[PDB]
């Protein structure tokens, strides 16, 4: 579990979330889908509250030190030197908190046709306020704005830390 660290430079003029969702996330997603994807994403500043604030520090994890060396995080990122800082120090970490995606209900009219094409009951208005239940919690965690690379759209990825120390990672990096 060798870990490479990136620090978001504060007091610049752009919120750290925009820098995360603009340049770092597509680059790491492309590097993950190019490579085995075994690298994991860690946020060693997470602080859940009434609102799930993200933090300021990015960590990437790998089983192999040479895998992180070949990932070449020092390479590229030559235009974000004034916003994020990379360091050439990689070491095995004692703690590695993984993050899991909490993808959920989409919308009313979005799910309307795909629920009527199988669930022919046409329930309509009642109990669909249950969706207003679930989002009420899910709109309290940290998320990332990401554009759909393939299907020409954009959506939000909601994530939360989990206690499972090992597993299979997604294309983005979540467990």
């Amino acid at each position: 579990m060798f870990s490479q660290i990136l620090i978001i430079k504060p007091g610049t003029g752009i919120s750290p979330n925009i820098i995360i969702s603009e340049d770092i996330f597509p680059v790491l997603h492309s590097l993950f889908v190019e490579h085995d994807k075994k690298f994991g994403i860690t946020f060693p500043a997470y602080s859940f509250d009434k609102k799930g604030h993200l933090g300021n520090i990015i960590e990437v994890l790998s089983e192999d030190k040479e895998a992180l060396a070949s990932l070449c995080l020092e390479e590229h990122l030559a235009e974000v030197t004034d916003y994020v800082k990379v360091k050439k120090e990689i070491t095995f970490t004692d703690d590695y908190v993984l993050f899991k995606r909490i993808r959920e209900e989409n919308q009313y009219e979005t799910t309307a046709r795909r629920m009527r094409k199988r669930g022919h009951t046409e329930l309509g208005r009642p109990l669909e306020m249950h969706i207003k239940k679930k989002n009420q919690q899910i709109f309290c965690h940290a998320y990332i704005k990401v554009k759909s690379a393939s299907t020409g759209q954009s959506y939000n990825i909601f994530l939360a830390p989990t206690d499972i120390k090992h597993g299979s990672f997604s294309a983005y990096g979540l467990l």
Binding site: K50, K133, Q136, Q137
Partner: protein, 45 residues
Amino acid sequence: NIPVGYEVHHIVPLSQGGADSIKNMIMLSIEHHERVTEAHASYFK
């Protein structure tokens, strides 16, 4: 913070002279709140 699936409901309705004091409400389930509200609306109105 407020627990998920639980809402604040006053035992004495505010529309019928309820009080905004600590001793006036108890948290209830997401369904039982609706049942109490519908029963009170049916009784009064």
